[PDB]
Amino acid sequence: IDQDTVVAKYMEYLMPDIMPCADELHISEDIATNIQAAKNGADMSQLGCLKACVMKRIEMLKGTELYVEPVYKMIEVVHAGNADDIQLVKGIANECIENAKGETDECNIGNKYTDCYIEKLFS
Numbered sequence: 001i002d003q004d005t006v007v008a009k010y011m012e013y014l015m016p017d018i019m020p021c022a023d024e025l026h027i028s029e030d031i032a033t034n035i036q037a038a039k040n041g042a043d044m045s046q047l048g049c050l051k052a053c054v055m056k057r058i059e060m061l062k063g064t065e066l067y068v069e070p071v072y073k074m075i076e077v078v079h080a081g082n083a084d085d086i087q088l089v090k091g092i093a094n095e096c097i098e099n100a101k102g103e104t105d106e107c108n109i110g111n112k113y114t115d116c117y118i119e120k121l122f123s
C-alpha cells in the first residue's frame, strides 16, 4: 500500500470530519508547520489532541480512553488491496497503545499514540 494511498484514504475517509477538529482549537496540527515541530515536524503537544479529535469522532477516544477497535474496522476499507496489509496496520496500532498506555492528559495520550503511528506506519 503506497503511502499516497495511506494519507489519501485516512483523509478522504473522514475529510468532512477532520475539518471541524482543526477549527476546534485553531489550526490543524498538520499544517501547523511543515517539518519544524518535533515528532514528525507537524506537531506533538497540540497534535496529541487536535488530531486526536478525529479519534473521538469515530468513538475511539472517550475523554482519556484510548481505543482502537473502531480503527480495526476502517483499516479494512481504508487499506483496500491486500488482506495482510490490513492485518499489518492492525498490529501497528498495538505498539502505539502499549506506548500511550492510556495516559491521563488528552494531548498526552495522542502525542504518544501519534508518535508510534509515524514510526511504524508513518501515517
Ligand SMILES: C[Si](C)(C)CCC(=O)[O-]
Pocket (backbone or CB within 6 Å): 006, 007, 010, 011, 051, 054, 055, 071, 123
Ligand atoms: C484518526 Si487517525 C486514523 C489517527 C488519522 C491518521 C492520519 O491520516 O493522519
